[PDB]
Symmetry: C3
Subunit: 327 residues, 3 copies
Amino acid sequence: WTIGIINRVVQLLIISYFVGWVFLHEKAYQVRDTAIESSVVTKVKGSGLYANRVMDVSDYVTPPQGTSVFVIITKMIVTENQMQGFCPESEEKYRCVSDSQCGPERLPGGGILTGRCVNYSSVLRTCEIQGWCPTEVDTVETPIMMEAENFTIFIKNSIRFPLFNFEKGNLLPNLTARDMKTCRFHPDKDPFCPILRVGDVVKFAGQDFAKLARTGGVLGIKIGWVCDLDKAWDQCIPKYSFTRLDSVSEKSSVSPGYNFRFAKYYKMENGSEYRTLLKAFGIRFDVLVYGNAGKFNIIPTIISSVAAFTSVGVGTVLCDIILLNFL
Amino acid sequence: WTIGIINRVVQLLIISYFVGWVFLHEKAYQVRDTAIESSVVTKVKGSGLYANRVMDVSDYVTPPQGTSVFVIITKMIVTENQMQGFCPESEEKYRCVSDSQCGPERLPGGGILTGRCVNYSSVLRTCEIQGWCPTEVDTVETPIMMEAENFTIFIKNSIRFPLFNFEKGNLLPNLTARDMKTCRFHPDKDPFCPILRVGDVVKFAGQDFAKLARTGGVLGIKIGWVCDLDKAWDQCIPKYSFTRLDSVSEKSSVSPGYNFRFAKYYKMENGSEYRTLLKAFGIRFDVLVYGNAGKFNIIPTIISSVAAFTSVGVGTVLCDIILLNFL
Amino acid sequence: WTIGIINRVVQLLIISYFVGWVFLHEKAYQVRDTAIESSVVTKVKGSGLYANRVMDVSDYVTPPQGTSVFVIITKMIVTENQMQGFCPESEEKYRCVSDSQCGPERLPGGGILTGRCVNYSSVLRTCEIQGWCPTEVDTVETPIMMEAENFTIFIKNSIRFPLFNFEKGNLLPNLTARDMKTCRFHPDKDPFCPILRVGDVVKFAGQDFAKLARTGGVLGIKIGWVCDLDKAWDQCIPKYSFTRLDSVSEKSSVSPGYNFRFAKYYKMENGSEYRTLLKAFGIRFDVLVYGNAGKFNIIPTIISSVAAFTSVGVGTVLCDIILLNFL
Ligand SMILES: COc1cc(C(C)C)c(Oc2cnc(N)nc2N)cc1S(N)(=O)=O
Ligand SMILES: COc1cc(C(C)C)c(Oc2cnc(N)nc2N)cc1S(N)(=O)=O
Ligand SMILES: COc1cc(C(C)C)c(Oc2cnc(N)nc2N)cc1S(N)(=O)=O
Ligand SMILES: *[C@@H]1O[C@H](CO)[C@@H](O)[C@H](O)[C@H]1NC(C)=O
Ligand SMILES: *[C@@H]1O[C@H](CO)[C@@H](O)[C@H](O)[C@H]1NC(C)=O
Ligand SMILES: *[C@@H]1O[C@H](CO)[C@@H](O)[C@H](O)[C@H]1NC(C)=O
Ligand SMILES: *[C@@H]1O[C@H](CO)[C@@H](O)[C@H](O)[C@H]1NC(C)=O
Ligand SMILES: *[C@@H]1O[C@H](CO)[C@@H](O)[C@H](O)[C@H]1NC(C)=O
Ligand SMILES: *[C@@H]1O[C@H](CO)[C@@H](O)[C@H](O)[C@H]1NC(C)=O
Ligand SMILES: [Mg+2]
Ligand SMILES: [Mg+2]
Ligand SMILES: [Mg+2]
Ligand code: NA
């Protein structure tokens, strides 16, 4: 019967359409490159106020080179004019009653204990230590640079897909509403402006500057390079996203936030040495570049095609058995 | 007719050859690892002259650890002995006529404005600012360290393909014409010597040292690790390439080059604090490691094979219809 | 004969089992993501002794931010109070007999030669140089901070597979025997504790602290994220490994170990400038994050399936020919 080949042919057509849409969707005809070779250069603009002193970019940004990971310092704890000597440490966990409990077996990873149980103050007696005296007092409260909210991070980024040798940057003037310098990134109003506001990146991360600034944190400015290299070059476009990477699990057991120490090293006119020890809290920024590019290639196209052919060839036989048996 | 199976068999053979060469070419029988786990350690050698002072590696290289991204400083702008205070800023964009136009709404991302319109000089009246005084004057011209051309970057690089747990380095003495220390990288005369000359990397990048040095720039020393792990180990060889990553698009709207500030922090015998503010221009180097390794594996070999079988099985039927119909 | 379809059917079943186990093993039904987007933050705890001075984290860790690559300084060579001037260099390779052999053509990549052959000491006459005087003497022996063995590296790591948008961290309290702070990483007794002991990482690397400390070295703390995202989330677990990346090939020709210089910059009450030049040896740590995630996906499942179907369809025909011919 000719209805055998009309039923057949119709069968073939419908099944072929399903399969074809599925494969063409996922671009299974494409080899993919996922090893994006990115380079990132950043610049911070702004000046803040702290105590009775002004902080400029050289004061609160570290490292100064503009690497993919940098810190804006928002709050700091100063221990000025330390000198090598012996002094009672200030952290309660060094508490003692006798010099018997200041031996080497106590806090083995801690400081260098001299062995003397000495009176730090009238209310607390701690083991004495040799090292930078006086010891740090990391249990006070200090101001935070509010002006950090109005600082700007300018993110130059140049990427290359090496499989296809396709290199492009995120400085796209034909894709920004405003001139390069005047523009600021809004995920909707200007998604390709490379100048981000610190408070913005804080808010897209969905976190509060006051709290973050105080305790420190790690924000990720993610640069994504999903591209179809079958398509025109003007279509390989970077999409920015924002997240808080020091995300706070409910369990905790470790102090959240971000802080690190470093010293400004001075030497006396006398000759002896003395430093200013700084415990710094601020927002670390991690520009995380992702990308993946697809291109037509003879081998994945052939493999995808053969897969389609055979899959339909079986689909019509099983559809014939299900139809003929009618259940 | 036996000519049916001679025509058939010949058909089969030719088509099979085409397909086989295509698949064997792309090594479709291989699973590929593209997540190269690289570690890079660099060392700069050389000394330059600047003003009436000598710069050695500790003076002009930053950071000193030898990371994958480091800067050779070729020109710098010194603002010596800054102190916290009030002074007219020097940048014309702060110009004012009355203190009415030095309110907070002016240059909100700029410095900390005191509110006074003051006479910086007799020809320019700018808003006064609180901060490091005197302000910077970033519109002058200074010399550049020419000797930077004769500096050398020694690039130790150790990579590992984790899918295959295949780790190798780029220090290959059996692959260099000269002893390790005496050798210098030439893309032809010695493509595996890990000691590169700064001016060389500048020239392979195709850019002029004088200009670059003056304005700063970002060069990429790309280490490529394309390897067939089916093949012998002696064949996993690194290939170096060189490119300028701060490439200059015609549109511009942002100053090209590379510069960053940082301060040397001093404290008076009196007690007050004072810094030397340095605006640094130089060549940043970005060692960008790429690699991808192939290996035979049962699954991609089976999939590739099945693809070949079916593709020929259809190719001979369609060749039979085209031949039989003769058009 | 019904034995034709019993032999057939049995054939089909056995071959189908072989193929099915092979494909299901390699999870060929999965698309794989190998572009792990990781962020690493590290903290060092401990204090060491060096000469008659104490070193704390700000003194011996660099950079202080806690990046994926940081150095614990174990031994250092101090050249105190350098000043710009002219002096005979101390390295024997500058040896001369007359000022004729101190011209510009000698050691062109070396220092700035003045041109005078001068008597450094009574036993050695070297070319004079302009630069930081006195010159460095990098041929002496100094102590090493032994307490570095009892220091701890705490490795916070947050990863994201962007293809599947699957983000997880290595801080897993339900996976550690001990509270987060008290725990220490043992590859068996606690493989998910993020606090590693320096001497531990040295020993898992299989190297001796005394020797390493003295000469410097590069250790890699590898964080591996092999995960089946078909499987439950609690199964995406990080596995740590440890290796020495400045591995010593037998050929050598370059000094092993790890060292870098940097200067502490001071200025006189007089006004002139003078630095302390430090040649630092220590253990650099490279947290190298790898990961690869698999997930079921319609396209690789279809391709794998079709491959299986056709492979069995041919396997039974060739098994029929081998059986029928009986050899
Ligand atoms: C410091 O200079 C740079 C540096 C970079 C890299 C190194 C991040 C850069 O990346 C691009 C280069 N080319 C285009 N089309 N887009 C880019 N995003 C642009 C400049 S530039 N010319 O100053 O603005
Ligand atoms: C600082 O020391 C290093 C460091 C590295 C890594 C960390 C970059 C190194 O990488 C190799 C190690 N092994 C081989 N075969 N090739 C390499 N390229 C070699 C030395 S070394 N032994 O001083 O020259
Ligand atoms: C500095 O703070 C951080 C930072 C990070 C990243 C930036 C490395 C971090 O990574 C995780 C975040 N969330 C989970 N579940 N696991 C993690 N490993 C945890 C903390 S935290 N909350 O202080 O301990
Ligand atoms: C580390 O601390 C232990 C005490 O817990 C001590 O016995 C050991 O000697 C220390 N290691 C070094 C190298 O000092
Ligand atoms: C140098 O002088 C300071 C006080 O000005 C003193 O505390 C210190 O001990 C002196 N240095 C030496 C080595 O005596
Ligand atoms: C940022 O600048 C605007 C002026 O453009 C000002 O109104 C605002 O208060 C500033 N933000 C902070 C946190 O000071
Ligand atoms: C310290 O002395 C300098 C001049 O030598 C002076 O300008 C400065 O104001 C003094 N510091 C204080 C706190 O008075
Ligand atoms: C580099 O050294 C050579 C001598 O080997 C010298 O002729 C040349 O002038 C030097 N280059 C520069 C820029 O000084
Ligand atoms: C400053 O004084 C030191 C000695 O205290 C001297 O060596 C140096 O030359 C002086 N500086 C100048 C510029 O004379
Ligand atoms: Mg403390
Ligand atoms: Mg300025
Ligand atoms: Mg030397
Ligand atoms: Na197939």
